[PDB]
């Protein structure tokens, strides 16, 4: 795999997002990672509805928290609508999705990164965004603004991103925290330290989905 990988220059990466006070990020995670893989098979760039996951993964607790393999199960069993189709509401509210006419676009299913593997994340990222986990709740986290964040920060994951690119030092995050955030919505975390969890414990649960 090569030394740098960055979705956004091949545009398979949709513009950052504000999840808001809703405790939605587990479904803006999943969203990345729909977004990536739907260009990589198809070609085109389309927003999917992170709505749509919050009000309709079952498994899943809404604003109170929830699992991307849930929501990336739930798009390979049912399918996905457009934002547009089901735009942000910051609030978890009934499933519409059958109000709301076919799906956009549908998944084959949902695979697992091997845990605590920093080569296998990476080789993961090569292929397309995936799903990670890291422990946001640390200010140092919080106050982020720029350059290759190595903390302070522990590894009580509490907060699920998506990590669409690397380089020698570095994985690269897209957060759901808006453009004023970090590196216009993004973070470049430390690789390489050789601590099997990942700084923050980014290597504690990644998921990516399958398409064929």
């Given amino acids: 795999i090569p030394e740098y990988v960055d ?8 513009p950052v997002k504000n999840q808001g006070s809703c405790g939605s990020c587990w479904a803006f995670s999943a969203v990345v990672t729909i977004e990536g893989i739907i260009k990589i098979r198809t070609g085109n760039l389309n927003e999917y509805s992170e709505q749509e996951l919050l009000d309709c993964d079952r498994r899943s607790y809404g604003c109170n ?4 393999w849930s929501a990336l199960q739930l798009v390979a069993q049912y399918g996905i609508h457009y934002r547009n189709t089901y735009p942000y509401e910051g609030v978890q509210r009934y499933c ?3 109000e ?4 956009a676009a549908k998944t084959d299913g949902v695979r697992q990164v091997q845990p605590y593997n920093e080569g296998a994340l990476l080789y993961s990222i ?6 990670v986990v890291l422990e946001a709740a640390g200010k140092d986290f919080q106050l982020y603004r720029g350059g290759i964040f190595v ?3 522990g590894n009580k994951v509490d907060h699920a991103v998506a990590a669409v690119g690397y380089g020698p030092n570095y994985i690269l995050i897209k957060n759901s925290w808006g453009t004023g955030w970090g590196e216009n919505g993004y973070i470049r975390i430390k690789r390489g330290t050789g601590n099997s969890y990942g700084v923050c414990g980014l290597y504690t649960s990644s998921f990516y989905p399958v398409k064929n």
């Fill in 126 to 131: 090569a292929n397309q965004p995936v799903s």
């Fill in 7 to 14: 979705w956004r220059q091949k545009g398979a990466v949709t």
């Fill in 151 to 153: 903390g302070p920060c």
């Fill in 65 to 68: 928290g929830g699992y991307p």
């Fill in 96 to 98: 519409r999705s059958r």
């Fill in 100 to 103: 709301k006419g076919p799906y």
